[PDB]
Design a protein around this nucleic acid. Structure first.
Ligand SMILES: Nc1nc2c(ncn2[C@@H]2O[C@H](COP(=O)(O)OP(O)(O)=S)[C@@H](O)[C@H]2O)c(=O)[nH]1
Ligand SMILES: [Mg+2]
Ligand SMILES: [Zn+2]
Ligand SMILES: [Zn+2]
Lengths: 185, 72, 929, 113, 187
RNA sequence: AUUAAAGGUUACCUUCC
RNA sequence: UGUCAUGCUUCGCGUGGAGAAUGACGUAGCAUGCU
RNA sequence: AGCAUGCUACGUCAUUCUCCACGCGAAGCAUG
């Protein structure tokens, strides 16, 4: 509706309403119907041209939306996968995973794959005394919700630091990035 | 929590593959073995231990991921 | 112990051996004895309990028992004289067991006695029956045969699967320790036939009249004629024995100098490829009295029934010759005065030597067709390549086309988190839930492409029973006589997808679309006419798949070249298009499950079977382990539609092309050319249809074996007892085809064994009362047939049986069946595994597919597939469909929300409201359309 | 118990000659089995040794079919007490089973010595 | 063909109509004007459609002509590529040993599987374990196919150069198998 | 398959043909 | 790098039928003109 | 009354829209 032809047709239609009154407007009903049909034909000719434009515009807009969304998905692929991974890990809320994640956040990351056997070699990197104090007590080492027995500790420069030497008093006596080897208990 | 680990393993291996771990044959073989064993697992403790191993593989690489920011 | 001692003393005779008193009026009655019988009343090859045969075992010095028995029997006077007369003519032969004739008194009467001396416990019919009717739980005879002859120790059978060819491939070694003991029998039988011909005796040789040392001892059914003209009838002896000659590798001694297993191998000239003389010598040495003529090269055969006959012997004999002599035959041509190396022949292990008829030396210029043909073949690719020695596989490695090896890996698979969260919020994936996640995208490492190719070690040379195969072929062509076939021109060919790879090396310049529009309809016709009198080898490329599944094992596919597909379409497409356009036939390719198709197929299968039961089976390593004699056979029945458009030479050269570029060829796995032992390719134009033919052939063979191994005297029905006496004749006593019996055995097999076949999947409705009596095949008969004819063990855990027909097949094409009320009547509907649908929803193989709004057509198809679950009694299954509808509604709402802010378009025309209502999906299973 | 076939062979008269120019004068007998299709000749019995071809009247319009024969054998028959030093030719390309049938039936009927 | 005749006919129709407005009398003349206008409009409508049909057909024919010309320009490219590949592969051949093996044949045909064995100048060995390396390629020189090969280079699955001294039983677990070893024929 | 197979009194008879 | 067949869903362009509207040719009823 | 012309009504042929049945492209899902 709201078209210049529409109103025209409407007016003609209105006249056809008057056909009820005045006995078909003094019996001009045949001419009235002819004019009404002609105007309606013009209006119908007008309508389809706009329907076609609407279809074309809708198709174009859908295609633009598709292209934009595909480009966005294929652009943020690396950034959107790590966030998902860490949200899922946070949701799991496991004792072992949280321990290693926190330690790695501080800086105590491993140097190989945590072996799942009774007797296997694990090397970890302690960056500071505080982490050593918290994890390393005596001859035992708490990591990944498990107990490991220390077999050797190597300073940043290859040497063999004895467990006795590692203390608050000797804290500045060593290059602190410290490699610790241990065996699963 | 079996489905959660079976999906987190998929996401974790995708992240590892995007970080170009395929370039090391040994490490990629180990990662594939760990990923394919969690998916067939029927117990939860085994799946979580293998998840620990795979996540340790991910955490070994230092500069690959800024863990401090991701953990926000 | 008075008369017994005298009888034992007489049985011992002058041989002075020490005989244990194991015999009396009776003796070892029977364990189980296999006999090949043919009378005017009964006929078959069956295992009985023969009661009376006085058997005395002989003990060696030191009082130790050995495998030597004296068999004494009581004979009537008429037969005693006949056997004495016929024995005195053949006594001067090394291949005849010694007989002793003596009369002894029992209850006042002189009864005659015949005593055969030093016979092994078993006979050659027991070995053949043991290996041809194999039951895992009943192996006493086979076990004792293997132990007695030092093939293995008795502790070898405590292993887990000592009989499985896939789990324990070492059994192939154990059987190989029987090879010489069988080759010596093959030599002694020729000696015996020579003696029979010279002495003038006519008789039928059977397996049960020869022991395991090779001596013959039953002359009761022989007759006498003029000396110098005898006739040994060896048709059921060699035929029943043929499958055993390849399993035990009997002819391996022919690979050593002087045919001695202790001497070193023979050193063949490296440039030799024509072994016609050796094949003729082998045939004349081991199968001297086989009647039918043998053509070493199948180019000279007379029809398709004469190609199988000779191809069988070629299969047997090709195991004696070096592996480097089989393949394309190379020659040097000149083009523009410049030398090329091109293929001008082929040495098939199974068809002999074939030479191209159009070899043109000194060419001037090459057109498009000639360039295509020269670039397709592997001659100049392999010639100009580094030698390769791959220790990772046992296959024959031809060459390496690069200086680096390529290690292909498969990736993990993407996770659609929104759908998973929605499903979890809807109450899915909880503990104890019946429906869980079982389908994932499995990742693979670099050693996956070659470890999957190394499964071709399961394809072993399988010689077949020819006299039986030549009948099953006739009964299998009656399933394909309601179609039409022939050749079509290049303008009548339909190609669905033209954006597919064109193989190697053509994938370096474009897709299949580049070569179909760059060649005129006159160029394609020229190529097709060329292939009818020349052989064109090609290269197939092995690739890894990226798809969801439930098993770790990597899946590989074989893409064939463009020449092979181009020329095979024009040959087969007219027939293939007619197999997929027929309704109500045994083969149900081309029939859909929608609009009441599943119901129609099931009701067609049920037919009018009496006392019906349903069964289904599976083929282990179907594509890997298929023997090369059944693939040629499958390709020979598809070509029987060309009686009017092709001559015999054209048909043979088409068969040669098919074999050269599908069956045995060169594969490009990781940038290196290897040789393919055999099997089936997953890119051939006729894979599904050839598999259907193979399935039908195996089923018919199982039925034939089931009917002929029955007693025969215990069959109550008169009609089914004259059908067994006439099947034996048509197999082993008729040389021509009896057209009136392949129509009678074919009808019997339709009223009692109704099949529904789709590629390698089959469902059978069978008469349950006949199967129990041994008149139709059971699941044990299939397990028996797949063992000696497929080199594969089929366990009764991947097969199913159903005694109630209102529940439908347990599985067919991964679909289950369910009888549900629908519109005042009940129908059968298929439903999938809910885990499959959920896994398809959750995991995708492309990062873009994880955006729901972009992919709403992805879920409409999944909902169509999952609709039938709505009617399942379990309420955890019915919720998947509702979940999918709700997710579709949510995706539509999100899409309408997004596109209103980024743009200002409120979608004016929307008919999507029907996609989240069940009325749209229910019409997909109503029979109107 | 695997015994030769039980088929019974019927006797008929025919002519044969040394060369393809067969002399169509009755000088041979043929043993045939009529159960399958029409008639099938299994073997030919005669007195002369020079036969190498045999012409059979084909059951068709103006059809004369010549069947090649294999080298003869020798047999001695006694229908009456006489020499009957006859010769048996087997149609070329005759499998072993058919030869056994012919020989068994012939041996039973005439002793063949 | 249609434009000018249609315009002239409609102009005549409008001119005839103008008479009705000018005077209006003689209504029969008004009927004649209306009839002439309608007939002229019908003639223009008749003329207006065949032109569109012919134009569309001509456009389709031109597009088909363009398509045919662009599917015979990629044929030349593939022909040239195939010729170049064949000639290069030929250049890679060895024309001295190949001629010997060919001329030693009875009629010139030789199996394909022996040409690499007897004429190739390089060998590649792919070794999955150390037990196989010890039994096949041990040392700096070995024998295969009745020839003597001298090890030229060894690399691992990562295409990293591996020295012959690193391949040992103790050091095997630290290597990335399989190892690809390329060797050169000795004279 | 033993006296093709089964049964009754290896003789006869019965049963399958 | 990404093979061969079968089925189904969605969208866009071309061929054949049915409903409504506009153009001239023929026939029936009534009225007017010549006769 | 008969014949022809003009006006007003009913049956046969070409164009403009609206619904059904068939071909060619693009995307997607399932099976062997
Ligand atoms: N050409 C081609 N053939 C395929 C493909 N997938 C499956 N098949 C065929 O289907 C049968 C096994 O079916 P099925 O899946 O039930 O068994 P399985 O060993 O996978 S468990 C084999 O004959 C396969 O050649 C394919 O992509 N291409
Ligand atoms: Mg016997
Ligand atoms: Zn032949
Ligand atoms: Zn043909």
């Amino acid at each position: 509706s709201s078209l210049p032809s529409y109103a025209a047709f409407a007016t003609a239609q209105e006249a056809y309403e008057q056909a009820v009154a005045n006995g078909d407007s003094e019996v001009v009903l045949k001419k009235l119907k002819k004019s009404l049909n002609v105007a309606k034909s013009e209006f119908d000719r007008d309508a389809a041209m706009q329907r076609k434009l609407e279809k074309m515009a809708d198709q174009a807009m859908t295609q633009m939306y598709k292209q934009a969304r595909s480009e966005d998905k294929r652009a943020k692929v690396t950034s959107a996968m790590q966030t998902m991974l860490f949200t899922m890990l946070r949701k799991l809320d496991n004792d072992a995973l949280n321990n290693i994640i926190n330690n790695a956040r501080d800086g105590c990351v491993p140097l190989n794959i945590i072996p799942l056997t009774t007797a296997a070699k694990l090397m970890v990197v302690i960056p500071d005394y505080n982490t050593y104090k918290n994890t390393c007590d005596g001859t035992t080492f708490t990591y990944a919700s498990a107990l490991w027995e220390i077999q050797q500790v190597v300073d940043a420069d290859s040497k063999i630091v004895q467990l006795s030497e590692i203390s608050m008093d000797n804290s500045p006596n060593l290059a602190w990035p410290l490699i610790v080897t241990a065996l699963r208990a | 929590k079996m489905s959660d680990v079976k999906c987190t393993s998929v996401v974790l291996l995708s992240v590892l593959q995007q970080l170009r771990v395929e370039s090391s044959s040994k490490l990629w073989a180990q990662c594939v073995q760990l990923h394919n064993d969690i998916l067939l697992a029927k117990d939860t403790t085994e799946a979580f231990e293998k998840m620990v191993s795979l996540l340790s593989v991910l955490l070994s690489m230092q500069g690959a991921v800024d863990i401090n920011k991701l953990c926000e | 112990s008075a008369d017994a001692q005298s009888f034992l003393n007489r049985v011992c005779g002058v041989s002075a051996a020490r005989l244990t008193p194991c015999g009396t009026g009776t003796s070892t009655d029977v364990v189980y004895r296999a006999f090949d019988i043919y009378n005017d009343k009964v006929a078959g090859f069956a295992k009985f309990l023969k009661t009376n045969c006085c058997r005395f075992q002989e003990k060696d010095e030191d009082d130790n028992l050995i495998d030597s028995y004296f068999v004494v029997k009581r004979h009537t006077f008429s037969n005693y004289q006949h056997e004495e007369t016929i024995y005195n003519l053949l006594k001067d032969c090394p291949a005849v067991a010694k007989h002793d004739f003596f009369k002894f008194r029992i209850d006042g009467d002189m009864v005659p006695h015949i005593s055969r001396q030093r016979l092994t416990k078993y006979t050659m019919a027991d070995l053949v029956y043991a290996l041809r009717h194999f039951d895992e739980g009943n192996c006493d005879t086979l076990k004792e045969i293997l132990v007695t002859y030092n093939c293995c120790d008795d502790d070898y059978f405590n292993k887990k699967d000592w009989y499985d060819f896939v789990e324990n491939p070492d059994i192939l070694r154990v059987y190989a320790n029987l090879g010489e003991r069988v080759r010596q029998a093959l030599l002694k039988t020729v000696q015996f036939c020579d003696a029979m011909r010279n002495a003038g005796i006519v008789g039928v040789l059977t397996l049960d009249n020869q022991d395991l040392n090779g001596n013959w001892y039953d002359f009761g059914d022989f007759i006498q004629t003029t000396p110098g003209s005898g006739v040994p009838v060896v048709d059921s002896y060699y035929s029943l024995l043929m499958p055993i000659l390849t399993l035990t590798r009997a002819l391996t001694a022919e690979s050593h100098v002087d045919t001695d297993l202790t001497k070193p191998y023979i050193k063949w000239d490296l440039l030799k490829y024509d072994f016609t003389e050796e094949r003729l010598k082998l045939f004349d040495r081991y199968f001297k009295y086989w009647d039918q003529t043998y053509h070493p090269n199948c180019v000279n055969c007379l029809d398709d029934r004469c190609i199988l006959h000779c191809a069988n012997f070629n299969v047997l004999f090709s195991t004696v010759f070096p592996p480097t002599s089989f393949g394309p035959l190379v020659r040097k041509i000149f083009v523009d005065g410049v030398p090329f190396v091109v293929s001008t022949g082929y040495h098939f292990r199974e068809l002999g030597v074939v030479h191209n008829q159009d070899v043109n030396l000194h060419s001037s210029r090459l057109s498009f067709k000639e360039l295509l043909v020269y670039a397709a073949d592997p001659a100049m690719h392999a010639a100009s390549g580094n030698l390769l020695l791959d220790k990772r596989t046992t296959c024959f490695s031809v060459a390496a086309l690069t200086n680096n090896v390529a290690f292909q890996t498969v990736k993990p698979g993407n996770f659609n988190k929104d759908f998973y969260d929605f499903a979890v919020s809807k109450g899915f994936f909880k503990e104890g839930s019946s429906v869980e996640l079982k389908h994932f995208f499995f990742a693979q490492d670099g050693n996956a492409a070659i470890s999957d190719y190394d499964y071709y070690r399961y394809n072993l040379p399988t010689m077949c029973d020819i006299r039986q195969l030549l009948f099953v072929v006739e009964v299998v062509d009656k399933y394909f006589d309601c179609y039409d076939g022939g050749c079509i021109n290049a303008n009548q060919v339909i190609v669905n997808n033209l954006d597919k790879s064109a193989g190697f090396p053509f994938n370096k310049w474009g897709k299949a679309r580049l070569y179909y529009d760059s060649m005129s309809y006159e160029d394609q016709d020229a190529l097709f006419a060329y292939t009818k009198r020349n052989v064109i080898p090609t290269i197939t490329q092995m690739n890894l798949k990226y798809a969801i599944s439930a098993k770790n094992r990597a899946r590989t596919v074989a893409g064939v070249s463009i020449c092979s597909t181009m020329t095979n379409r024009q040959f087969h497409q007219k027939l293939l298009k007619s197999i997929a356009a027929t309704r109500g036939a045994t083969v149900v390719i081309g029939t859909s499950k929608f609009y009441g198709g599943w119901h129609n197929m099931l009701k067609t299968v049920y037919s009018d079977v009496e006392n019906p039961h349903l069964m289904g089976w599976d083929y282990p390593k179907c594509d890997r382990a298929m023997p090369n004699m059944l693939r040629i056979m499958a390709s020979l029945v598809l070509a029987r539609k060309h009686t009017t458009c092709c001559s015999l030479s054209h048909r043979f050269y088409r068969l040669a092309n098919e074999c050269a570029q599908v069956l045995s060829e060169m594969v490009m796995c990781g940038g290196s050319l290897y040789v393919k032992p055999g099997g089936t390719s997953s890119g051939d134009a006729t894979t599904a249809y050839a598999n259907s033919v193979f399935n039908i052939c195996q089923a018919v063979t199982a039925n034939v074996n089931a009917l002929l191994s029955t007693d025969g005297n215990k069959i109550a029905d008169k009609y089914v007892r004259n059908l067994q006496h006439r099947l034996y004749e048509c197999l082993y006593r008729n040389r021509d085809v009896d057209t009136d019996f392949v129509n009678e055995f074919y009808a019997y097999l339709r009223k009692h064994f109704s099949m529904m076949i789709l590629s390698d999947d089959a469902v059978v409705c069978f008469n349950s009362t006949y199967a129990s009596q041994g008149l139709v095949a059971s699941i044990k008969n299939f397990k028996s047939v797949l063992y000696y004819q497929n080199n594969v063990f089929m366990s009764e855990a991947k097969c199913w049986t159903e005694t109630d027909l209102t529940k439908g097949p347990h599985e067919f094409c991964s679909q289950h069946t369910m009888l549900v009320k629908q519109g005042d009547d009940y129908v059968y509907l298929p439903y999938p595994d809910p885990s499959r649908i959920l896994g398809a929803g959750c995991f995708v193989d492309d990062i873009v597919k994880t955006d729901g709004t972009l992919m709403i057509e992805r879920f409409v198809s999944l909902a169509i597939d999952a609709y039938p679950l709505t009617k399942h009694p379990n309420q955890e299954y019915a919720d998947v469909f509702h979940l999918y509808l709700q997710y579709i509604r949510k995706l539509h709402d999100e899409l309408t929300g997004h596109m209103l802010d980024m743009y200002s378009v409120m979608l004016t025309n929307d008919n999507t409201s029907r996609y989240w209502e069940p009325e749209f999906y229910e019409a997909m299973y109503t029979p109107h359309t | 118990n695997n015994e030769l076939s039980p088929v019974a062979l019927r006797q008929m008269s025919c002519a044969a000659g040394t060369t393809q120019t067969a002399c169509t004068d009755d000088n041979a007998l043929a043993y045939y089995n009529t159960t399958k299709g029409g008639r099938f000749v299994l073997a030919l019995l005669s007195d002369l040794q020079d036969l190498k071809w045999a012409r059979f009247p084909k059951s068709d319009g103006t059809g004369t079919i010549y069947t090649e024969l294999e080298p003869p054998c020798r047999f001695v028959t006694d229908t009456p007490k006489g020499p009957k030093v006859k010769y048996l030719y087997f149609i070329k390309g005759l499998n072993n089973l058919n030869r056994g049938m012919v020989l068994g039936s012939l041996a039973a009927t005439v002793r063949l010595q």
